[PDB]
Amino acid sequence: SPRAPVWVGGWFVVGLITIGLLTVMMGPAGTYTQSGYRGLMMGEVDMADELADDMAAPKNQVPAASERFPDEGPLAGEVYVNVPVLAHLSADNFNRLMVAITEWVSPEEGCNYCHDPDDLTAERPYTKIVSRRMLEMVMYLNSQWGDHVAPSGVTCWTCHRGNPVPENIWFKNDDADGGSGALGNTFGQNAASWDAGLSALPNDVMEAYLLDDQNLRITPTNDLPMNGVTQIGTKQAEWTYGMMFHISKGLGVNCTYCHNSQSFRVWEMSPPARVTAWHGIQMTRAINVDFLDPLQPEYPANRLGPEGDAPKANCATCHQGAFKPMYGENVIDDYPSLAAPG
Amino acid sequence: MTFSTHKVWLMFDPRSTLVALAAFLVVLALLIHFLCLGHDRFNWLEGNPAATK
Amino acid sequence: MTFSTHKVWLMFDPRSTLVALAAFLVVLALLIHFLCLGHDRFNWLEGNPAATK
Amino acid sequence: MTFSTHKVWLMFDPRSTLVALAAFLVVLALLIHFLCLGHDRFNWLEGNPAATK
Amino acid sequence: STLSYWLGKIGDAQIGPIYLGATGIASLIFGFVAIEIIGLNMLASVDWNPVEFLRQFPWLALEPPGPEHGLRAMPPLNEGGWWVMAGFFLTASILLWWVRTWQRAKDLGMGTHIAWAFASAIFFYLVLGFIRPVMLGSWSEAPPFGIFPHLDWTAAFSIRYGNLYYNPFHMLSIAFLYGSALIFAMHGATILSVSRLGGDREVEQITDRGTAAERAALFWRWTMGFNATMESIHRWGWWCAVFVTLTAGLGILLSGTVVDNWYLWAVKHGVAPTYPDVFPGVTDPAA
Amino acid sequence: AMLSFERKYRVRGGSLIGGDLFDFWVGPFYVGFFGVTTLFFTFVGVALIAYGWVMDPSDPTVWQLSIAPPDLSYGLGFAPLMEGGLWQIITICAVGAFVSWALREVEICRKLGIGFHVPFAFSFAIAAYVALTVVRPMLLGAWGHGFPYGIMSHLDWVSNVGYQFLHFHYNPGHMLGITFFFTTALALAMHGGLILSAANPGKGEKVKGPEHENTFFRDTVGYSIGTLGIHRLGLILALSAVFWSIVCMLISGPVWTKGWPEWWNWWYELPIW
Amino acid sequence: SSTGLTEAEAKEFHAVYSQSAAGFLAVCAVAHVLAWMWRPFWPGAEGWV
Amino acid sequence: SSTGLTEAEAKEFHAVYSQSAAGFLAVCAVAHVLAWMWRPFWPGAEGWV
Amino acid sequence: MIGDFSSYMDVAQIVLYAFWIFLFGVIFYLRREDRREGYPLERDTDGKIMSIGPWNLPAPKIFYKPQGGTYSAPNAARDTRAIKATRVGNFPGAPLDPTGDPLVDGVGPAAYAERADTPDKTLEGRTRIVPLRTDADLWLAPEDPDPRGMAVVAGCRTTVGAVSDVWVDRAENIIRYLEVSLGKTVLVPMPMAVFNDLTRTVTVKSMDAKSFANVPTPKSAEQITLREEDRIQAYYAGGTLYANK
Ligand code: BCL
Ligand code: BCL
Ligand code: BCL
Ligand SMILES: CC[C@H]1c2cc3[nH]c4c(c3C)C(=O)[C@H](C(=O)OC)c4c3nc(cc4[nH]c(cc(n2)[C@@H]1C)c(C(C)=O)c4C)[C@@H](C)[C@@H]3CCC(=O)OC/C=C(/C)CCC[C@H](C)CCC[C@H](C)CCCC(C)C
Ligand SMILES: CC[C@H]1c2cc3[nH]c4c(c3C)C(=O)[C@H](C(=O)OC)c4c3nc(cc4[nH]c(cc(n2)[C@@H]1C)c(C(C)=O)c4C)[C@@H](C)[C@@H]3CCC(=O)OC/C=C(\C)CCC[C@H](C)CCC[C@H](C)CCCC(C)C
Ligand SMILES: CC(C)=CCC/C(C)=C\CC/C(C)=C/CC/C(C)=C/CC/C(C)=C/CC/C(C)=C/CC/C(C)=C\CC/C(C)=C/CC1=C(C)C(=O)c2ccccc2C1=O
Ligand SMILES: COC(C)(C)C/C=C/C(C)=C/C=C/C(C)=C/C=C/C(C)=C/C=C\C=C(C)\C=C\C=C(C)\C=C\C=C(C)\C=C\CC(C)(C)OC
Numbered sequence A: 001s002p003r004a005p006v007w008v009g010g011w012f013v014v015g016l017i018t019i020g021l022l023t024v025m026m027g028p029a030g031t032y033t034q035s036g037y038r039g040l041m042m043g044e045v046d047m048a049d050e051l052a053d054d055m056a057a058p059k060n061q062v063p064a065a066s067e068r069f070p071d072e073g074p075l076a077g078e079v080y081v082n083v084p085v086l087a088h089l090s091a092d093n094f095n096r097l098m099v100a101i102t103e104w105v106s107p108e109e110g111c112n113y114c115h116d117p118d119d120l121t122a123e124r125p126y127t128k129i130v131s132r133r134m135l136e137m138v139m140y141l142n143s144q145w146g147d148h149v150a151p152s153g154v155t156c157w158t159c160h161r162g163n164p165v166p167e168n169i170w171f172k173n174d175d176a177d178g179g180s181g182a183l184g185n186t187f188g189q190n191a192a193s194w195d196a197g198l199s200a201l202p203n204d205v206m207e208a209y210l211l212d213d214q215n216l217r218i219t220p221t222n223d224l225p226m227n228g229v230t231q232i233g234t235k236q237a238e239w240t241y242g243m244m245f246h247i248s249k250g251l252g253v254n255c256t257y258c259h260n261s262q263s264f265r266v267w268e269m270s271p272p273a274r275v276t277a278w279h280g281i282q283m284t285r286a287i288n289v290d291f292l293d294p295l296q297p298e299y300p301a302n303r304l305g306p307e308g309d310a311p312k313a314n315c316a317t318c319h320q321g322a323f324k325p326m327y328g329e330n331v332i333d334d335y336p337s338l339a340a341p342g
Numbered sequence B, C, D: 001m002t003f004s005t006h007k008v009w010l011m012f013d014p015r016s017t018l019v020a021l022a023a024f025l026v027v028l029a030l031l032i033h034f035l036c037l038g039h040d041r042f043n044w045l046e047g048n049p050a051a052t053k
Numbered sequence E: 001s002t003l004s005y006w007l008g009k010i011g012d013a014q015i016g017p018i019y020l021g022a023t024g025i026a027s028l029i030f031g032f033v034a035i036e037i038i039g040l041n042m043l044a045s046v047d048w049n050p051v052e053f054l055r056q057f058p059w060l061a062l063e064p065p066g067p068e069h070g071l072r073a074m075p076p077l078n079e080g081g082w083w084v085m086a087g088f089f090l091t092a093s094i095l096l097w098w099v100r101t102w103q104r105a106k107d108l109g110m111g112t113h114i115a116w117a118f119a120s121a122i123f124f125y126l127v128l129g130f131i132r133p134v135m136l137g138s139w140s141e142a143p144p145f146g147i148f149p150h151l152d153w154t155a156a157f158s159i160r161y162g163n164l165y166y167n168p169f170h171m172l173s174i175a176f177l178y179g180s181a182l183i184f185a186m187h188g189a190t191i192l193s194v195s196r197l198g199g200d201r202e203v204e205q206i207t208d209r210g211t212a213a214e215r216a217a218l219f220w221r222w223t224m225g226f227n228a229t230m231e232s233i234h235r236w237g238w239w240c241a242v243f244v245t246l247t248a249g250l251g252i253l254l255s256g257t258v259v260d261n262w263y264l265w266a267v268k269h270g271v272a273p274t275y276p277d278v279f280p281g282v283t284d285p286a287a
Numbered sequence F: 001a002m003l004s005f006e007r008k009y010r011v012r013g014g015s016l017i018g019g020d021l022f023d024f025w026v027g028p029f030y031v032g033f034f035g036v037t038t039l040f041f042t043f044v045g046v047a048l049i050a051y052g053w054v055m056d057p058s059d060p061t062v063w064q065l066s067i068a069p070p071d072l073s074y075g076l077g078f079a080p081l082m083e084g085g086l087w088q089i090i091t092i093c094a095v096g097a098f099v100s101w102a103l104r105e106v107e108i109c110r111k112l113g114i115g116f117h118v119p120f121a122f123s124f125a126i127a128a129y130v131a132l133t134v135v136r137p138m139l140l141g142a143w144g145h146g147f148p149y150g151i152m153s154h155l156d157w158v159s160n161v162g163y164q165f166l167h168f169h170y171n172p173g174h175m176l177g178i179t180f181f182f183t184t185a186l187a188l189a190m191h192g193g194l195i196l197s198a199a200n201p202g203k204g205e206k207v208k209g210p211e212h213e214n215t216f217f218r219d220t221v222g223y224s225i226g227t228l229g230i231h232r233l234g235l236i237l238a239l240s241a242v243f244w245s246i247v248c249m250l251i252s253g254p255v256w257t258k259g260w261p262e263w264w265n266w267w268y269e270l271p272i273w
Numbered sequence G, H: 001s002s003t004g005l006t007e008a009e010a011k012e013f014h015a016v017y018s019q020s021a022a023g024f025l026a027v028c029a030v031a032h033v034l035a036w037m038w039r040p041f042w043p044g045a046e047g048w049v
Numbered sequence I: 001m002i003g004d005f006s007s008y009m010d011v012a013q014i015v016l017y018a019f020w021i022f023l024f025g026v027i028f029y030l031r032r033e034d035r036r037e038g039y040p041l042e043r044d045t046d047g048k049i050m051s052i053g054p055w056n057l058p059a060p061k062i063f064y065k066p067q068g069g070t071y072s073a074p075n076a077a078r079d080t081r082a083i084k085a086t087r088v089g090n091f092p093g094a095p096l097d098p099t100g101d102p103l104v105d106g107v108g109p110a111a112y113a114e115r116a117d118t119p120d121k122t123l124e125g126r127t128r129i130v131p132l133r134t135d136a137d138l139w140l141a142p143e144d145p146d147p148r149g150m151a152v153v154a155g156c157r158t159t160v161g162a163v164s165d166v167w168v169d170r171a172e173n174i175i176r177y178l179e180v181s182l183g184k185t186v187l188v189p190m191p192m193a194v195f196n197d198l199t200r201t202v203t204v205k206s207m208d209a210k211s212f213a214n215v216p217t218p219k220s221a222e223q224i225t226l227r228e229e230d231r232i233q234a235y236y237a238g239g240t241l242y243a244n245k
């Protein structure tokens, strides 16, 4: 059969209509905000519809709080028996806090999730024991970690968001290691893991930084090597990078939110959000070391991890994909009881 | 181009033209289907409520 | 051109001119439909209220 | 190949066969030596205790 | 010696025959051992499942030893020993292939220019995998054998040594890669434009200058004021391609050995731009 | 008539505006209407870059010189001359100068009676520059999306734009462009070496012809691209590299607004598995 | 003419192509009527309310 | 002349082209009237209120 | 410190400057190789040879040609053929105007180089470009249309003849020229021809009917020299500027 010469103009029109196909197919274009200097391109790249949907998500709507009773009446420590951490609240405020906590942690299961159905005084369920340490942790976070959580504060809704198990929790060997026998060592990486943003980066970094105090500072403070300072660290850089993937995914931001890529090391070129993130790293490590990990004996086997360790919190446990938890909604002003230990 | 314009094929060779026309029509169909899929009211697979505000 | 100026095709090739005109018309139609789709009032698929302030 | 199959060299060129065999044997020897070095009990230069568990 | 219609449209249609020779067979044996090691470690990393292998192949790799092993000659197998073996066998196969290319040039009576252009790439590959880890005393500074993992290694190497954009030899290597693309587009377009005059037969134009070579020279002389000859443009391209990997090896040698932070190196030498302080009161909270 | 064979080629013709006024040479360079416009735009742009250099309060070196685009708040509008307007005017002049260079190359090709492959290939670099400074900024709604005009600051722009997606290496168009750029250097090295080996066979050897050239690659890789196919292959490789660079930058921001590694969830969670 | 196709073969081809295009447009009109009966696609003043 | 037509082919092509362009413009005008009845194009002093 | 020579200087800076020296030397060497053809330069007004330093012009290198002979570059040979073109006033850079027919004279885009007056050979010493009617070991791929028999149309939409044969490169298996019998036989370079297999025509837009009648012809009908090839190709290339206008 004769070969037909290619219709250049017709295929050019087809190319134009395919460009239209691409435009309708793959974007109304993302919305930009500029945080740094011009020409640097430090800022946020967000789809407007997706950002609006995440703000209008049910988890980002802090439940309405009832009017607070005047703190002048019979305390909860005399009316009730087993209230070691809430013995300074007026009984009316104690009941208001119980209702709020039920709305925040177990709205579906109701008051019976953390209480014996026929005895509110009995510390039978493990959930009551865990909730007491939850209350203590929230008070500790509000009183002692205002460098990070103020002025918004943290309540039971900040992590739990209306269900007993918070959405973003982690364990020690959260990503199953690969390799059979003497072959296939994945080295805690080389997998399509969502902890590393679906990259082949170290996906089990939360243990080194949010439970351990390992160094995230890989970049030297001098241009030339020192005699006692290490001259290597490319693989150690991958651990920091994976941790920064976790941080970026937990806040729904990019690297430029806290860094100038010209030098990831220089704080003077960094947005003031990097200072809040430093306090956040310290606070998350404190949370895991002091409250969430020592709760392992109180958990059933259904709640533990592959390594038998307690569930732990990270940047994404509170923020849930936003730069601030619930995008900055104040949650502690309505509940002064959760703002400081008694 | 009407039913009586039969000599258009003396200018546009059908063998080198219909393949491009078919490609154009297929791409247009894909474009419109994806345009309908990109809106909440006409994404028939997602099945959102008709009244979308 | 005009209904009477038929000698333009002694100067402009009747086929390359039609191809260029079709390309221009397709591009213009896509551009104007995209401009209508990019505004709240005239996006007929989003169906915002006509009174859009 | 046996002690009595001397006619193999009428079918296989001795020079290329010997060079390919030398290459294969060197690669095999290196691979096995490296596999021994890659295990605790058989790295003779690292000198771990034989009882390795 | 089969034919190929589709390849005969862009160029020639004949595929083969290929001459391997002694060094070719040796290189194939070494390289197959290396590839078997790498691929079997990748398949074992998904617990031998080929469904998961297909899912995760870009993410899979053979990983170098950790920093805890240093430059141990042969680490434990599943702790980087497989990587060291795969690197050794790949290096041996690549070196034997270089010898093969040199020998193929010699037996055809041709010059050994492709061999010495391959030597530059081999130098860069050796700096990446063997030479620099030896000087730094750590196998861990070497790239993994994986698709997404060596991109992760690339990014983490740039991050570890302070924005490799500020490495002057990285700048030179990027200039030479851009120039390789520039020169090769220039030369392809020039030869295609004078193909109506016999310009694709360049070696015949070298020993007997025709109007194709003259017009190719004059186009560039009238465009940018200077030109090359039909043979000199190939030296230009050869050197531009060689300098890519030469400067790449040179800039990787200097990272961690003599320079540990490249952005601070540029700050010392007045190279890094200074931007107005948009964030006036941000300091190190750990200071 | 500078080269020993140039006199017979210096004739009238090739103008794209139909006129003999600009048809002349100044030294080796051919001057056209588009040569004049190229020099006009070039001197304007260089003088404005020097102005922005001397007006910089930080006293930058040649490396630290930077003329930055306007803020993203100015949108697709007009900025003060010291607040992005200088970058805008230099961008307009650069686009004009590059288009004029391509059109002058078209004029030179028409005068020499050769194909327009070189202006066409340079149009790809011009399209990359335009997609970086004009098209992508309009797609994103602000001229502040273009890169600053500085030797070292445009590297910082590249770095921060890449880290806006947390791992730019995972961009598929970026992967394709890098593959094509590295393959272009590989092919250029192979071609230059083959031509140099054929033209310089050594001592006691005659200059090798097309048979030896084809035999070397059929004996090494197993396929010979030919002498015409190698130049088509090289032009195609460079043009594909630049085209995929344009695609990868046009899908970053206008299309993809999240991390690039998670785009591969289409393959990791393909409906098959 | 410039195609080399006979003026009668072109007439036959245009007849068949015209029938094909008319059938295609009839199917498209039916599909558009069905899609309007599913969900009308021209909003009123109140919008999709 | 410059294209190769003979003022008769040009006259016939212009006849069919004039009819096609007039029909396309009439369809465009009808579509514009319909789109104006849907939602008017040009704002008032107070805008779209 | 590790890689420092002083408080400012360091090893990387010195290696960078050493590479700067090496790169500048390589560029100098490359520019020397660029001057193996066309140098020394000459003036645009009287043809006086300009003096170039021996450090810019390399010593001549000898090419031992595959079929015998030695070409040197530079070779002290200068193209001094009389150009049939004039200009008003010998101003530097003033372009020339052909006196007569620029296509037949070889002026500008029709200019050609005085190459070897012997046909190009292969490795075994047999003519590289030959018509297909002479060689039986070479045929045309059945997947591609056969140019032979196709009508030949010039740039003025005139059928000037038909393709009678194809000249094939025996060293690359590629069609180099089309032998066209004018309705007396000419060679059309294939890159200058566009094929239409549906209408069975070959369009050469670079030629008119007048230009086809003046195309240079080889001395032999089965043999073409490098100079004849060069002249014919230059004629068709100059037709892009001098034929349809
Ligand atoms: C549509 C049917 C006829 C036609 C019939 C007429 C008639 C009648 C008139 C013109 C006139 C004009 N035509 Mg006409 N014209 C045709 C196709 C064209 C094409 C084309 C490439 O298709 C072009 C570029 C033009 C261009 C023009 C303008 C130069 C000129 C008036 C400009 C104008 O009104 O601005 C607005 C338009 C544009 C900016 C873009 C032009 C596109 C359309 C096709 C313009 C036609 C508008 C015309 C008024 C429609 C009247 C035809 C009715 C359907 C009966 N015509 C075809 C062949 N045309 C007028 C004139 O010459 O004044 C003395 C005039 O009276
Ligand atoms: C070493 C001295 C002789 C030789 C002496 C013998 C004798 C005797 C016998 C064989 C037999 C065999 N030989 Mg032999 N064989 C030789 C060289 C070779 C070479 C080679 C290219 O060098 C190869 C591939 C082989 C391969 C083989 C096998 C195909 C076959 C039995 C397989 C086997 O035992 O499993 C193991 C095989 C391998 C792991 C690969 C082969 C490697 C070695 C060289 C195989 C030798 C095995 C043989 C039993 C050792 C006997 C040598 C002693 C000095 C007697 N021989 C040389 C020339 N060979 C046996 C046979 O065919 O009986 C049915 C047998 O009885
Ligand atoms: C479908 C059967 C016939 C056909 C039958 C008719 C009839 C009858 C008429 C036209 C008319 C026109 N045709 Mg027609 N037309 C055909 C194929 C085509 C093709 C093509 C390459 O497929 C194109 C681009 C066109 C284009 C055109 C327009 C240029 C012109 C008036 C514009 C218009 O109505 O809407 C704008 C154009 C578009 C939106 C794109 C064009 C695509 C479709 C095919 C347009 C045809 C619509 C037609 C009116 C519907 C009748 C089909 C019935 C179901 C039988 N036709 C086939 C061969 N066509 C009208 C005319 O010339 O006015 C005086 C007219 O009365
Ligand atoms: C100037 C610098 C550029 C460059 C240069 C360069 N590279 C080169 C050359 C040159 C000039 C060569 O001569 C050489 C070559 O041959 O290229 C085609 C080579 C080469 N460049 C290569 C790749 C390469 N070059 C790269 C880059 C570049 N190379 C630079 C940009 C890169 C990148 C971007 O990372 C890569 C990946 C190779 C194609 C080749 C060297 C090949 C080699 O080393 O082979 C030995 C290694 C092996 C693993 C052997 C193969 C093992 C397989 C298992 C074979 C199959 C065996 C099986 C038995 C076959 C039969 C099966 C049966 C079922 C049929
Ligand atoms: C498309 C494939 C590759 C390509 C092709 C290509 N480029 C080409 C050609 C071709 C085929 C030419 O014919 C043409 C040429 O003549 O080359 C010698 C050209 C050319 N490629 C050039 C460079 C170049 N090509 C590049 C890339 C590429 N070119 C691609 C990889 C790059 C890169 C990647 O950075 C550069 C720098 C020039 C040497 C030349 C075009 C010369 C030109 O346009 O001259 C007219 C303009 C001036 C003399 C100066 C204008 C200055 C402005 C008025 C102000 C400055 C604006 C600028 C944006 C500032 C930048 C600051 C910082 C970002 C540094
Ligand atoms: C009205 C008025 C003001 C008049 C004044 C007129 C004046 C002053 C001048 C004329 C007008 C103009 C516009 C002049 C231009 C001025 C300028 C700015 C000139 C320089 C522009 C420019 C792009 C310069 C070169 C820049 C660089 C570094 C380019 C890269 C080149 C490179 C990497 C290597 C060089 C390799 C070479 C020489 C390649 C060319 C080359 C190629 C590519 C072949 O394939 C080929 C094949 C066969 C034979 C020869 C060749 C050959 O020479
Ligand atoms: C199951 O698998 C089958 C069997 C089907 C086979 C398939 C295999 C497959 C699919 C393999 C896929 C492999 C891939 C995708 C590999 C990708 C690799 C990439 C991208 C690598 C990138 C960079 C790597 C570099 C630069 C590595 C360099 C390493 C070097 C130079 C190491 C040198 C080491 C030496 C010289 C060691 C010497 C031995 C000593 C001297 C130490 O002994 C004491």
Ligand code: HEC
Pocket (backbone or CB within 6 Å): A080, A081, A082, A083, A084, A085, A086, A087, A095, A098, A099, A100, A101, A102, A105, A106, A110, A111, A112, A113, A114, A115, A120, A121, A122, A127, A128, A129, A131, A132, A135
């Ligand atoms: C788990 C998230 C709980 C839910 C659901 C409810 N309560 Fe609670 N309750 C919880 C804790 C951790 C404590 C101890 C307080 C302390 O200071 O340690 C309590 C205690 C009470 C008591 C006191 C009983 C007693 O001491 O005798 C009462 C009366 C009480 N809570 C009431 C109550 C109501 C009404 C609830 C539904 C709105 C409810 N609880 C749910 C933890 C949790």
Ligand code: HEC
Pocket (backbone or CB within 6 Å): A215, A216, A217, A218, A219, A220, A240, A241, A244, A245, A247, A248, A251, A253, A254, A255, A256, A257, A258, A259, A264, A265, A273, A274, A275, A276, A277, A278, A279, A281, E159, E286, F163, F166
């Ligand atoms: C705010 C939520 C941040 C985001 C977004 C990113 N980073 Fe991070 N970075 C942040 C802090 C608080 C710190 C200091 C941690 C410490 O222990 O001091 C850092 C530090 C780094 C570093 C190392 C700096 C050094 O001195 O070596 C690197 C390499 C780094 N950050 C990289 C990085 C990347 C790649 C990011 C995008 C994925 C990113 N950061 C985002 C806070 C925040």
Ligand code: HEC
Pocket (backbone or CB within 6 Å): A141, A148, A149, A150, A151, A152, A153, A154, A158, A247, A250, A251, A273, A274, A276, A277, A278, A280, A281, A282, A284, A313, A314, A315, A316, A317, A318, A319, A323, A324, A325, A328
């Ligand atoms: C619950 C205890 C949290 C944990 C775990 C983490 N963060 Fe947080 N963060 C929390 C609150 C209540 C707020 C609001 C602060 C306010 O001013 O209202 C924040 C805020 C931040 C910010 C500031 C964002 C900004 O736009 O300024 C950053 C940068 C931040 N947090 C970082 C961060 C990181 C990196 C964390 C993991 C180590 C992390 N936070 C955990 C509450 C909680």
Ligand SMILES: CCCCCCCCCCCCCCCCCC
Pocket (backbone or CB within 6 Å): E224, E225, E226, F027, F028
């Ligand atoms: C920015 C890097 C360096 C680029 C230099 C390119 C220079 C190209 C123009 C050369 C002009 C030469 C003019 C004189 C030629 C000889 C005249 C007798």
Ligand SMILES: CCCCCCCCCCCCCCCCCC
Pocket (backbone or CB within 6 Å): F074, F075, F076, F077, F078
């Ligand atoms: C100059 C007055 C102060 C600033 C007013 C706002 C300027 C920016 C908004 C208007 C211009 C932006 C849109 C320009 C579109 C150009 C399309 C070619």
Ligand SMILES: CCCCCCCCCCCCCCCCCC
Pocket (backbone or CB within 6 Å): E111, E112, F200, F201, F202, I021, I022, I025, I026, I029
């Ligand atoms: C001060 C630094 C000087 C650097 C000079 C570099 C010169 C490089 C020359 C490379 C080519 C040599 C000749 C090769 C000819 C072909 C041999 C087969």
Ligand SMILES: [Fe+3]
Pocket (backbone or CB within 6 Å): E187, E191, E202, E234, F191, F195, F231
């Ligand atoms: Fe070449």
Ligand SMILES: [Mg+2]
Pocket (backbone or CB within 6 Å): A173, A174, A175, A176, A177, A188, A204
């Ligand atoms: Mg793990």
Ligand SMILES: [Mg+2]
Pocket (backbone or CB within 6 Å): A173, A174, A175, A195, A203, A204, A205
């Ligand atoms: Mg994990």
Ligand SMILES: [Mg+2]
Pocket (backbone or CB within 6 Å): A044, A045, A046, A251, A252, A253, A254
């Ligand atoms: Mg975001």
Ligand SMILES: [Mg+2]
Pocket (backbone or CB within 6 Å): I001, I002, I003, I004
């Ligand atoms: Mg020292």
